[PDB]
Coordinates of C-alpha atoms in Angstrom, one line a residue:
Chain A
X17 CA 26.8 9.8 3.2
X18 CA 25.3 9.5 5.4
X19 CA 24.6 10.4 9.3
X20 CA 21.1 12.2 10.9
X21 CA 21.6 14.4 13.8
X22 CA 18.1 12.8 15.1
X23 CA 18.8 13.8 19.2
X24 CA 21.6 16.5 20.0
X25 CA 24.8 14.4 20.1
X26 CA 22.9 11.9 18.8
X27 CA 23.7 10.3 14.9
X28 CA 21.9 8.0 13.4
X29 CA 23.9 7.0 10.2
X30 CA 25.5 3.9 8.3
X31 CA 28.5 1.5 8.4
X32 CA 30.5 3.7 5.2
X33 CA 30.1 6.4 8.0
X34 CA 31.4 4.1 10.9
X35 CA 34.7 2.9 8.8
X36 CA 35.3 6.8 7.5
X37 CA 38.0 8.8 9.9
X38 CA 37.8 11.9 8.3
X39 CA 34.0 12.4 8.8
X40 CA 34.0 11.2 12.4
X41 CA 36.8 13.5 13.5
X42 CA 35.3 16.2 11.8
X43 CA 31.8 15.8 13.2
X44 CA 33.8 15.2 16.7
X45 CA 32.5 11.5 17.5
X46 CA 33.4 10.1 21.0
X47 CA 31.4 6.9 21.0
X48 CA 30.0 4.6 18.5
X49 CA 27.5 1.8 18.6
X50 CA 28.0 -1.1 16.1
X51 CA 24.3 -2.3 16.2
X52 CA 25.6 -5.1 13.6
X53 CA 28.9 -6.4 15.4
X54 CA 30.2 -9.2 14.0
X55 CA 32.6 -11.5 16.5
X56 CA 34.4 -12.4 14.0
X57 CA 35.9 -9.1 12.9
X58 CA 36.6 -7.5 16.0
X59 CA 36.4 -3.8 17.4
X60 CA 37.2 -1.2 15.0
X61 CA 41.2 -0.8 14.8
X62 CA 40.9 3.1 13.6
X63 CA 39.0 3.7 17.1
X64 CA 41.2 3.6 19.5
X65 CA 43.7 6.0 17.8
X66 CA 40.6 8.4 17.4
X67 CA 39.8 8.1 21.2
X68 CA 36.8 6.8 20.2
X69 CA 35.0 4.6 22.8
X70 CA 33.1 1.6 21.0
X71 CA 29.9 -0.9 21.9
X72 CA 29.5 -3.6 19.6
X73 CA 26.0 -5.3 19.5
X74 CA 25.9 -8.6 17.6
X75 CA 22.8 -8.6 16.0
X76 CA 21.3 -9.9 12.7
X77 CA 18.1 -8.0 11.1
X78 CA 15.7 -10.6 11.2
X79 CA 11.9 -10.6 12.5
X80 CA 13.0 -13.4 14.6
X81 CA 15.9 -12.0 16.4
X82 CA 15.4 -10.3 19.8
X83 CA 17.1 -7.3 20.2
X84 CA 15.2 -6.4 23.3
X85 CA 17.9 -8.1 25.1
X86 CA 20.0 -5.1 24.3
X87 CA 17.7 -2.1 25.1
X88 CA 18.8 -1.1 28.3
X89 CA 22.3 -1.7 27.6
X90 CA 22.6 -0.1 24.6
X91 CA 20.4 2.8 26.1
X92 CA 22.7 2.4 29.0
X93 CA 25.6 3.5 26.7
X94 CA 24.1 6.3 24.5
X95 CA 23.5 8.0 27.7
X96 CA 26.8 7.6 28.7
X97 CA 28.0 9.0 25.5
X98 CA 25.7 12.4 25.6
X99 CA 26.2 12.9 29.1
X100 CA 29.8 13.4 28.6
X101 CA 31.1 16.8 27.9
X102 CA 31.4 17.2 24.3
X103 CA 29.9 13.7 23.9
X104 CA 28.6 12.6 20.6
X105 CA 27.9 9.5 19.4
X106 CA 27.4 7.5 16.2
X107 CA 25.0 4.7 15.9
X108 CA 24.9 2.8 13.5
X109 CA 24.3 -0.7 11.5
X110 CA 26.2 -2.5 8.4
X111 CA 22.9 -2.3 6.6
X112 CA 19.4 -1.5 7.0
X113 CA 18.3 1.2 9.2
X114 CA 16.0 -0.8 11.4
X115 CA 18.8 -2.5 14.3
X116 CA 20.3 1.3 14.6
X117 CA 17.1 3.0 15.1
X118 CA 15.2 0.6 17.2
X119 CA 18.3 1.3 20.1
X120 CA 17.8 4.7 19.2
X121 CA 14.0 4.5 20.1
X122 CA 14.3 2.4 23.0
X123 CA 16.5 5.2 23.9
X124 CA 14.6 8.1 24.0
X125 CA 11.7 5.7 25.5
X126 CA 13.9 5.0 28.8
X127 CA 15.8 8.2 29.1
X128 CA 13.7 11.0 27.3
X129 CA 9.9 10.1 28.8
X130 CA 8.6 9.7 25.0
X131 CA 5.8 7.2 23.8
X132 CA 7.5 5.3 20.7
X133 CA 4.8 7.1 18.6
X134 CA 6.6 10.4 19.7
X135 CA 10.2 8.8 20.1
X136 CA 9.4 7.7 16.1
X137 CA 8.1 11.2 15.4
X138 CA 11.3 12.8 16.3
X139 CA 13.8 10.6 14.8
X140 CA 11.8 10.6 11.5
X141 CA 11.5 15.0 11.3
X142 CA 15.6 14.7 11.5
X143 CA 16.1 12.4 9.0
X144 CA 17.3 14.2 6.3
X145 CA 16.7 13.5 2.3
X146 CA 18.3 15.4 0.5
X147 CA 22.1 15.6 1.9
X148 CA 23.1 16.6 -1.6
X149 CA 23.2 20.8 -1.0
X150 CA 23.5 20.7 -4.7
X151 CA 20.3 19.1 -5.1
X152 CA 18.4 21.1 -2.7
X153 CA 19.8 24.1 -4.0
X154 CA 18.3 23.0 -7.2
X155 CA 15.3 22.3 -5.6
X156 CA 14.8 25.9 -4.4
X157 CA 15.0 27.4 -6.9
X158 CA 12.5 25.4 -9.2
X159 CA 10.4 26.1 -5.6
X160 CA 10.4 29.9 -6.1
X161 CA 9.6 29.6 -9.6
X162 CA 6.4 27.3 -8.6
X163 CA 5.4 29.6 -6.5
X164 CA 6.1 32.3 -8.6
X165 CA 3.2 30.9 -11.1
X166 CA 4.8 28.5 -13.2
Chain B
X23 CA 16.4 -4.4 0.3
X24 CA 14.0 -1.7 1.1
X25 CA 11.2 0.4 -0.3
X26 CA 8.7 3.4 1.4
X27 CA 5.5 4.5 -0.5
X28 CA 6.4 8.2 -0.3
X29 CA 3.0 9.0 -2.1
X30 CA 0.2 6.2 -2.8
X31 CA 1.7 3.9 -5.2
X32 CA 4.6 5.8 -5.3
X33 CA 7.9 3.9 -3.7
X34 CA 10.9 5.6 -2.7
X35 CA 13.6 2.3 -2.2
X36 CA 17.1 0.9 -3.3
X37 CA 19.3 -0.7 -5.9
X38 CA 18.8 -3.9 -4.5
X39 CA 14.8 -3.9 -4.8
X40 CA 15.2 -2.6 -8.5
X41 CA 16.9 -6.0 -8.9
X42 CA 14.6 -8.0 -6.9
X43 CA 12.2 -9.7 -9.3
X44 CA 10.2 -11.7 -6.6
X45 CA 9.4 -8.1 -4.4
X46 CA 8.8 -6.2 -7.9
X47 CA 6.3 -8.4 -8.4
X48 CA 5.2 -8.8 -5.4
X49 CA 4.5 -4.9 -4.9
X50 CA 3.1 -5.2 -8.6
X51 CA 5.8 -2.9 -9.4
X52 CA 4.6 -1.4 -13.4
X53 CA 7.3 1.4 -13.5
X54 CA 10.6 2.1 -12.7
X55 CA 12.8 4.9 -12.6
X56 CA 16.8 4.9 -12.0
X57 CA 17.9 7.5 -11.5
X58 CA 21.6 6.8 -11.9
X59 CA 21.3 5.0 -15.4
X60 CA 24.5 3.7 -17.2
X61 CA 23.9 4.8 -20.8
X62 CA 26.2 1.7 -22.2
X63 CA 24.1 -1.1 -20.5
X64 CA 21.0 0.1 -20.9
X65 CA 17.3 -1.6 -19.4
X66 CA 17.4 -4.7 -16.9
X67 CA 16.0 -7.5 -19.0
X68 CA 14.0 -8.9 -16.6
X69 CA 11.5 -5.9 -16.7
X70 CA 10.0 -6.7 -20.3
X71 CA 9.1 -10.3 -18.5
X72 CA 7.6 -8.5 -15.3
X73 CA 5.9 -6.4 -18.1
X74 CA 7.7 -3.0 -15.9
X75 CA 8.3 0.1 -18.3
X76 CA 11.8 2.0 -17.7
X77 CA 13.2 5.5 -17.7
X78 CA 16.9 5.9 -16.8
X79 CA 18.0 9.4 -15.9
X80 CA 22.4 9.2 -16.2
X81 CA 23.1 11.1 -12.7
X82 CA 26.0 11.6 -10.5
X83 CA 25.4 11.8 -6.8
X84 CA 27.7 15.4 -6.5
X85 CA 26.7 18.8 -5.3
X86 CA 27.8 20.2 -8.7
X87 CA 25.9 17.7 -10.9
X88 CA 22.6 19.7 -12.7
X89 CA 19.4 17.4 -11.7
X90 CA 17.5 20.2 -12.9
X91 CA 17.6 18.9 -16.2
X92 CA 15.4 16.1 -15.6
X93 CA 13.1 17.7 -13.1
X94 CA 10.0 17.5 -16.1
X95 CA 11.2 14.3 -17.5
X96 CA 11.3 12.4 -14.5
X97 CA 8.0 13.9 -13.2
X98 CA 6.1 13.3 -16.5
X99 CA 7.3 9.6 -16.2
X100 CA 6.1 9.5 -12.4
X101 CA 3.0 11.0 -13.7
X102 CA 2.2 8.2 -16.3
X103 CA 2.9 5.7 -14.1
X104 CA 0.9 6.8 -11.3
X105 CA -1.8 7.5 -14.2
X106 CA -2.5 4.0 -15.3
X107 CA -4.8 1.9 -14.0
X108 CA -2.9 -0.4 -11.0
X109 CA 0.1 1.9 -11.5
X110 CA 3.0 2.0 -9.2
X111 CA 6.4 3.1 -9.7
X112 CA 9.9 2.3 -7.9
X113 CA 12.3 5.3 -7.9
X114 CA 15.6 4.3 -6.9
X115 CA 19.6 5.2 -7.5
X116 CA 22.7 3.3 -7.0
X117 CA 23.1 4.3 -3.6
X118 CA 22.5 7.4 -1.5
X119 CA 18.7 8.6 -1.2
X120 CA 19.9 12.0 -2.9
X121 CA 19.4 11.4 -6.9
X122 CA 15.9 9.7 -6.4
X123 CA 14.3 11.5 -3.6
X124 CA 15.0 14.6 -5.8
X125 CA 13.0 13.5 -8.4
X126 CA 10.4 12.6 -6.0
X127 CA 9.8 15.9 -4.7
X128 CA 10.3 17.6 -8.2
X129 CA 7.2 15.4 -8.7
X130 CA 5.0 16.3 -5.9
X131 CA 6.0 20.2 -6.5
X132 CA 5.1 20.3 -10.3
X133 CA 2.2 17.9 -10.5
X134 CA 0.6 17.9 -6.7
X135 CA 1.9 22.0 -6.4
X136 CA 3.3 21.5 -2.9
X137 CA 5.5 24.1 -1.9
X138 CA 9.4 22.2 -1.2
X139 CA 8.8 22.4 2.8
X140 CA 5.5 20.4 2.6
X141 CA 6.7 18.0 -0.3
X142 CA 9.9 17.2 2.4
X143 CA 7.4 16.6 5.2
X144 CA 5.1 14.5 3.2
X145 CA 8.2 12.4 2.1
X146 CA 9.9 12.1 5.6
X147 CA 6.6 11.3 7.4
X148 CA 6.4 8.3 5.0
X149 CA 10.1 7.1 5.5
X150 CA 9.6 4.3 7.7
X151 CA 12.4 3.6 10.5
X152 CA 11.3 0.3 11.4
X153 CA 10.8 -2.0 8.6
X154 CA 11.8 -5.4 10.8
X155 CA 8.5 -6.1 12.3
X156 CA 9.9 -8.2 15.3
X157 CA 11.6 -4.7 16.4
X158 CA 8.6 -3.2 15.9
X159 CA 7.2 -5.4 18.1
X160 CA 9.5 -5.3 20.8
X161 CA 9.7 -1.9 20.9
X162 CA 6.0 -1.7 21.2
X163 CA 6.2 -4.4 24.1
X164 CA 8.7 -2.1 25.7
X165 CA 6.1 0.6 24.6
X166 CA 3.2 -1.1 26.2
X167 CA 5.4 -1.9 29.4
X168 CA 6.3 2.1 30.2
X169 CA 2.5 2.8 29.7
X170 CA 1.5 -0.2 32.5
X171 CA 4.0 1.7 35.0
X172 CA 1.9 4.8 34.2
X173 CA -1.5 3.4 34.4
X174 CA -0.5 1.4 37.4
X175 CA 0.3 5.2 38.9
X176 CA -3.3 6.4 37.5
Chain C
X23 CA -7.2 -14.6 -1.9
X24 CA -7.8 -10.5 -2.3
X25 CA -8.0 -7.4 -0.5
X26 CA -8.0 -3.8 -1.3
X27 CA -6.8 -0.8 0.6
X28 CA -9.7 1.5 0.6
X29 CA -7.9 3.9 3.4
X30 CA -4.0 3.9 4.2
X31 CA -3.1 0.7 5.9
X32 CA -7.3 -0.1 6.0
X33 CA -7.6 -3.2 4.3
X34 CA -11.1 -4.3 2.9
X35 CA -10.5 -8.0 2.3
X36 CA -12.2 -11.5 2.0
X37 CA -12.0 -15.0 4.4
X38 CA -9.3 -16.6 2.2
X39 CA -6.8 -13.4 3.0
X40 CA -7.9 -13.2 6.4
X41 CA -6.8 -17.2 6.5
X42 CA -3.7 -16.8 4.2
X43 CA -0.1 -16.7 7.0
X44 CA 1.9 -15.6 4.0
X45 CA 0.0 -12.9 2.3
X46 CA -1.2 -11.7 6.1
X47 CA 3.2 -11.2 7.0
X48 CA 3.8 -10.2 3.4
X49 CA 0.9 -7.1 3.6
X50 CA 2.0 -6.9 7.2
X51 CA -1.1 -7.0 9.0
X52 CA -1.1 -6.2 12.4
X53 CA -4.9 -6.2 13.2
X54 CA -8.1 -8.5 12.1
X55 CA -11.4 -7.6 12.2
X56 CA -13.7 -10.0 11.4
X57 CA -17.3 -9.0 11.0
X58 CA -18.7 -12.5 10.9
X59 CA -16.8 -14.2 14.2
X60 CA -17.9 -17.4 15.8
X61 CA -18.0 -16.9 19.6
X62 CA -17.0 -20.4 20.3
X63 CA -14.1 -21.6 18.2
X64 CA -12.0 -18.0 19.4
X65 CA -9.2 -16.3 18.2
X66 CA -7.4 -17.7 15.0
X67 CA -4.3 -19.5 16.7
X68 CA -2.4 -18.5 13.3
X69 CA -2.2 -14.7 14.4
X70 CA -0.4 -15.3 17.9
X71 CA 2.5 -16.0 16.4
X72 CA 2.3 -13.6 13.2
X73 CA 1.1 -11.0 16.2
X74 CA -1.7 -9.9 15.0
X75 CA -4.2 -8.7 17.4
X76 CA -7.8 -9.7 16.9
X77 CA -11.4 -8.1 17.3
X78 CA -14.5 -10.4 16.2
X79 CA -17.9 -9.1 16.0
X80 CA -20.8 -12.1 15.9
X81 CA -22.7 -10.6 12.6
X82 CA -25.0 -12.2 10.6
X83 CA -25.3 -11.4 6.9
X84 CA -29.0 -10.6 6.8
X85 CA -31.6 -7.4 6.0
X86 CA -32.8 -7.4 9.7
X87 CA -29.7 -7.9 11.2
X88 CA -28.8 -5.1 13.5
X89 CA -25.1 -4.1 12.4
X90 CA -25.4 -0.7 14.0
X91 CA -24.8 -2.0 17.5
X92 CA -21.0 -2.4 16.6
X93 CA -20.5 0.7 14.7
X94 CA -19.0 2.5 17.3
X95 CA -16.8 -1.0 19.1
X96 CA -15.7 -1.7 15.6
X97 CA -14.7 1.9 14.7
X98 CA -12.7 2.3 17.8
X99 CA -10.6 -0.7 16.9
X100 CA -9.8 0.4 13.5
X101 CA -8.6 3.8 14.8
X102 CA -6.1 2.0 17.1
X103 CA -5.2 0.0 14.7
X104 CA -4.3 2.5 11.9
X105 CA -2.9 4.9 15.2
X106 CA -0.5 2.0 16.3
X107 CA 2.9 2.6 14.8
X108 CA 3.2 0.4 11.3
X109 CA -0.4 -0.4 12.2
X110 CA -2.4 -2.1 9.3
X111 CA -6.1 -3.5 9.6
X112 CA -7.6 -6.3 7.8
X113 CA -11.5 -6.2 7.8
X114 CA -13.2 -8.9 6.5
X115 CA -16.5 -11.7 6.6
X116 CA -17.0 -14.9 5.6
X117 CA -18.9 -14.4 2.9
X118 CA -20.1 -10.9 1.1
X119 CA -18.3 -7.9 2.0
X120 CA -21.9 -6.2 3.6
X121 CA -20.5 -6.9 6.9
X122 CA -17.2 -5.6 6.3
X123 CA -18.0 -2.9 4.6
X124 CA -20.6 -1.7 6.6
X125 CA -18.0 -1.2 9.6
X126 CA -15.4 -0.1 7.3
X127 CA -18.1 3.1 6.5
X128 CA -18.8 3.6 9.3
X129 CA -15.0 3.9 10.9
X130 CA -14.7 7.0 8.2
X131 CA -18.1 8.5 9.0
X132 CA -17.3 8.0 12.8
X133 CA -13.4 9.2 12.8
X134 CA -13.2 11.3 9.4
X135 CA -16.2 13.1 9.4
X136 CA -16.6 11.9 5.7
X137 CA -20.5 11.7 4.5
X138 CA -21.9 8.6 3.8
X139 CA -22.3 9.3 0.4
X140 CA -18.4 10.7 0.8
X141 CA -17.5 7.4 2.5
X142 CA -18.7 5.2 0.0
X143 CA -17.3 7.0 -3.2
X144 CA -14.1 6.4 -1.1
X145 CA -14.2 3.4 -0.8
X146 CA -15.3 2.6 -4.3
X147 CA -13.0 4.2 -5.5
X148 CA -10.1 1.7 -4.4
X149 CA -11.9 -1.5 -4.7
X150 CA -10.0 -3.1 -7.9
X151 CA -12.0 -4.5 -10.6
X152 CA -9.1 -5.9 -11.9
X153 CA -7.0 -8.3 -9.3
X154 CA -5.2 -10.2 -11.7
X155 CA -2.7 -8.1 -12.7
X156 CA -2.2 -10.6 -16.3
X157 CA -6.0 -9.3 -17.1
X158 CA -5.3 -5.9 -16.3
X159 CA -1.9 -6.5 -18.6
X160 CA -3.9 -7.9 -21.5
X161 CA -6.2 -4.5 -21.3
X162 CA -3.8 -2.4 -21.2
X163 CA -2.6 -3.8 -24.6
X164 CA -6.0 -3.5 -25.8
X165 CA -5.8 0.4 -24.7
X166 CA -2.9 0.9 -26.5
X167 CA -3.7 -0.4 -29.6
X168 CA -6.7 1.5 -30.0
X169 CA -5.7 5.1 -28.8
X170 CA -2.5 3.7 -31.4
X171 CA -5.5 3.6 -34.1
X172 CA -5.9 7.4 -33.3
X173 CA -2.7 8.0 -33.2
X174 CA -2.0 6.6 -36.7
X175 CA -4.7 8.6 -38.3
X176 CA -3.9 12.6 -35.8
Chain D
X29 CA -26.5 -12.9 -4.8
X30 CA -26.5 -9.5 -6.6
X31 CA -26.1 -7.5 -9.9
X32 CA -24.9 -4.3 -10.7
X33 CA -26.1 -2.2 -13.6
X34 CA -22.6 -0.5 -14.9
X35 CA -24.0 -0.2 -18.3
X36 CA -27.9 0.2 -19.0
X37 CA -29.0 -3.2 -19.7
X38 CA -25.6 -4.9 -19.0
X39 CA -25.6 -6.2 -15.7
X40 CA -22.4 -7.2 -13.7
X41 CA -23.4 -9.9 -10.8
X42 CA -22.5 -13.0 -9.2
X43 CA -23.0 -16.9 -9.9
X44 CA -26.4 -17.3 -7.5
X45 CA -27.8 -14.4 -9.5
X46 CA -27.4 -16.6 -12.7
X47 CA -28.8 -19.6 -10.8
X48 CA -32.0 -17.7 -9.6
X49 CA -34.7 -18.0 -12.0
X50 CA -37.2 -15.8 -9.9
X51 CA -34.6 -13.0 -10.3
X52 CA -33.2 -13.5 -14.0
X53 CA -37.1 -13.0 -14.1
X54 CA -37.4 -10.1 -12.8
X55 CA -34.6 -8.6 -14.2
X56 CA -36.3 -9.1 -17.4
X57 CA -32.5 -10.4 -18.3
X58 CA -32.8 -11.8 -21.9
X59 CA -28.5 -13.0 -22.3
X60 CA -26.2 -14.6 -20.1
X61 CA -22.6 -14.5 -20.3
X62 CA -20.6 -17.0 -18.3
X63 CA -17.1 -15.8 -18.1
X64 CA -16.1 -19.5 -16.3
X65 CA -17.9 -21.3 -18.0
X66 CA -17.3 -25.4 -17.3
X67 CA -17.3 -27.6 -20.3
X68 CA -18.9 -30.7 -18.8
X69 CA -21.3 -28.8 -16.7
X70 CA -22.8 -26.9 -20.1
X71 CA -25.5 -24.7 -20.6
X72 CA -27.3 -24.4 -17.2
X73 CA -30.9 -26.1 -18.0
X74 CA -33.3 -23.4 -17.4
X75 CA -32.5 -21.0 -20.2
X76 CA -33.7 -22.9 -23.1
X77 CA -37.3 -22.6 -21.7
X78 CA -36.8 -19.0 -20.5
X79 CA -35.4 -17.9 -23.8
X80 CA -32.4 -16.9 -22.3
X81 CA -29.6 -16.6 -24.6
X82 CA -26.0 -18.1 -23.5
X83 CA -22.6 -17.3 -24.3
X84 CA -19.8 -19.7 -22.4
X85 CA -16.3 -19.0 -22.3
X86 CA -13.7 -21.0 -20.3
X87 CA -11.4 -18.8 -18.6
X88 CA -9.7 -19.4 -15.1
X89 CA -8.6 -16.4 -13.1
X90 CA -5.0 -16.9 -12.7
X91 CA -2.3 -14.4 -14.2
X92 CA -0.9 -16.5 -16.9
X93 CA -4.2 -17.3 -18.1
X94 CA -4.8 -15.0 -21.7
X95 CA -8.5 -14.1 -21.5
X96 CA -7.7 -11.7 -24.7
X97 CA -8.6 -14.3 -27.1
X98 CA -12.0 -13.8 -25.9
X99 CA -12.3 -9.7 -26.1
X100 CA -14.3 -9.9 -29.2
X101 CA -17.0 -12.9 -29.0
X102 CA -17.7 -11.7 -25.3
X103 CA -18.0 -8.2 -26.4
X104 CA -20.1 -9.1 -29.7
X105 CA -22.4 -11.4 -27.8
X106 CA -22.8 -8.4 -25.3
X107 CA -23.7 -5.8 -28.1
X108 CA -26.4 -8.4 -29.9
X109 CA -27.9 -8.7 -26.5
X110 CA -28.0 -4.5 -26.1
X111 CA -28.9 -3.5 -29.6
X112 CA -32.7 -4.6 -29.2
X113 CA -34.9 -2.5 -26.7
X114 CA -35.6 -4.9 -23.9
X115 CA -32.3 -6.6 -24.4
X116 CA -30.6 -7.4 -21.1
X117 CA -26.7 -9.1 -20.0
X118 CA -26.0 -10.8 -17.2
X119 CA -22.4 -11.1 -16.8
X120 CA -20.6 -13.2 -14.3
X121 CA -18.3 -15.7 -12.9
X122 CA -17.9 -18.7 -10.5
X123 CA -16.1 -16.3 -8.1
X124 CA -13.7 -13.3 -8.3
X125 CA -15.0 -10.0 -10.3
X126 CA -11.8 -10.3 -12.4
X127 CA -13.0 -12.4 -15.2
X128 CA -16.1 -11.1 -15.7
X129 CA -15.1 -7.5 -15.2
X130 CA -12.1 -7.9 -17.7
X131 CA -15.0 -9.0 -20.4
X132 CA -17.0 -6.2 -19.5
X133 CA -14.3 -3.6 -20.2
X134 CA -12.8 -5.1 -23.0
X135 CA -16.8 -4.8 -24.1
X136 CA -16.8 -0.8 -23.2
X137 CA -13.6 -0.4 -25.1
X138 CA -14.8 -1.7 -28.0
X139 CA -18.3 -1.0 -28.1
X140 CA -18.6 2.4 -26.4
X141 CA -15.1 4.5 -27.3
X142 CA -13.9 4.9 -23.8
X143 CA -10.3 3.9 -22.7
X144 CA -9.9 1.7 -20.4
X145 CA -9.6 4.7 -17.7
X146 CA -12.8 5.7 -18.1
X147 CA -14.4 2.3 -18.5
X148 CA -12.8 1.5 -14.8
X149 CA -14.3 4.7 -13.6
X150 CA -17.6 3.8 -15.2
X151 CA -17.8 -0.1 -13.9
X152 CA -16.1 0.7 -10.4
X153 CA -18.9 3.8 -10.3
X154 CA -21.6 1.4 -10.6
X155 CA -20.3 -1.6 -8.4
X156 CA -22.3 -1.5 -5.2
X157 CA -20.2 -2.2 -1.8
X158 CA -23.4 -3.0 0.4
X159 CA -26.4 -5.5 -0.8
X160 CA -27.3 -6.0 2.4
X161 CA -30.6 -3.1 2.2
X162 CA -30.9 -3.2 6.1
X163 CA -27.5 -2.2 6.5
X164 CA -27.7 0.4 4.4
X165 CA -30.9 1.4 6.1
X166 CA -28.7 1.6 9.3
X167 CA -25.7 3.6 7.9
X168 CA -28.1 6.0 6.6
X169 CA -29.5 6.4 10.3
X170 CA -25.8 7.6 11.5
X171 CA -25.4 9.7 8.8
X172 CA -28.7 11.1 9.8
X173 CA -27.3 11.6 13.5
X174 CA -23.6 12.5 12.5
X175 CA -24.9 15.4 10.0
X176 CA -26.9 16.6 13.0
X177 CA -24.1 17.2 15.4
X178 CA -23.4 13.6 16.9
X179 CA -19.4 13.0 17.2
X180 CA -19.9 9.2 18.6
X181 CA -22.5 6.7 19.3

């Protein structure tokens, strides 16, 4: 679709996500953070009507661009999202998981005690692969025949 | 542009790597399977330079579409590929992770005979979240900077 | 210009790799080992900025050369490597891979309880006979047309 | 400076084991095959008077390089050199297994009905990964200790 519930409140998902109205009111989205702003396209127009409160991060995924910069700060805000009532916030990047879930990270590093290798533990048992219930469904049932001996 | 080996020799990635002739053959990619094929435009030509060896499975990304059907086919394919000396084998769809990680655990189920829940947790704990390595280094800087706080304590 | 990954993200490789910038980012490499180091001419000044952290052990390649003192020092360095995050370990010498190898053993006697004999059907096991992947192309078409002999006549 | 046995008689080694007479010697190796073979460097001088039978073929280890056109003379010269009792290969290269190993497994295809599957098992079975006898001497030492309880050094 797509969007991980990776921390509670917490989604990590992609930019189709972050343009889609439907999907963010339903999953009842307060704050998003564009990890992939681009200066030259502004904030988000849909976001104000949704009461959605938006941080825009301008950053390009490249091995040479330092996104440390934007740790605390971006940390800063994710707390500020989950630590309102009913809070929940999408994070996200245009493309590319890497800019999303590196703020993520540095996240639960400053605000949840955890070594990265934990921090990357936990994001990576809530990432989901299979969103299509379909699929898993399918899935299931060739697992009970498996195990049933075939 | 991205690609996890999900099993050894075995990459899980996207459209854009199945187009990429300078990472397939950089990853000495010998197989690839799409799992969203278009019947009506058939193979990539560049594979029969790269000397790669196809399979397209036509599939639609919807919770009523039947993978099912190409559970064995696709896992035979995997099979081969994995089977042959130097071996390795791109599984990819047009977008979404849903038509080819399916086929990936089909795979590990029927020819490895790991239950769903431990084919799932051998596929996630391969799914890399930081594939830009200057990140990764940052965030091990920041990391190595919350530990020195500690050991300072200690 | 080779290596071979005789454990996950353990690479067993030779000087040229260890000296090559572009295959070192492209395999991404975090750690070298280097089992035949030169205590005066230091740390490779390529890997600060491809930051890659460093470990040489002063070993000559010779029968009454005492390896065995950095079995343990060399081990340990491998496991944080391969423990780090995205971690991935090039071990290497000069010239012959006895020095290499002989830590590389060792690492998976020390840290994975393997056997010797275990350890070094391992590693065996991974080391390509067949690097260039045109060769290994060029046999496989061989293969085929002679199992396509016994198909003919079945 | 080392040969492996992956076949009796055929052995799989490197260029200073083809330039040491004291070990051609013996080896009691009675062929050579030189899978990078250098046309104005020739025949290397000491075989003649050794009775040392030589089979060059120029090949470079690059990918776009066809070393096919060679299967059959290096895999007929290597089954002359095996068919006599006493008969013994050396098979090498300059530098890189690949050229030599490709001429050896073409050979076992051939020659000795395996696919090439079980020829790589049978060659990579046989390679040795440690030369060096005193390290091997030391290894077996921790093994020793590890087997008898020992978790670290």
């Amino acid at each position: 679709m797509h969007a991980d519930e990776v921390w509670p409140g917490l989604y990590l998902g992609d930019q189709d996500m972050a343009n889609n109205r439907r999907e963010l009111r339903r999953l009842g989205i307060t704050h998003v953070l564009n990890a992939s702003h681009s200066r030259w396209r502004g904030t988000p127009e849909a976001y104000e009507g949704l009461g959605i409160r938006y941080l825009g991060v301008e950053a390009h995924d490249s091995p040479a661009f330092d996104m440390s910069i934007h740790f605390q700060t971006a940390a800063d805000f994710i707390h500020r999202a989950l630590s309102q009532p009913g809070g929940k916030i999408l994070v996200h990047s245009a493309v590319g998981v890497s800019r999303s879930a590196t703020l993520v990270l540095a996240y639960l590093m400053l605000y949840h005690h955890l070594t990265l290798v934990e921090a990357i533990k936990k994001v990576k048992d809530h990432r989901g692969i299979i969103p299509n219930r379909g699929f898993l469904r399918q899935l299931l049932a060739l697992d009970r025949r498996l195990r049933q001996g075939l």
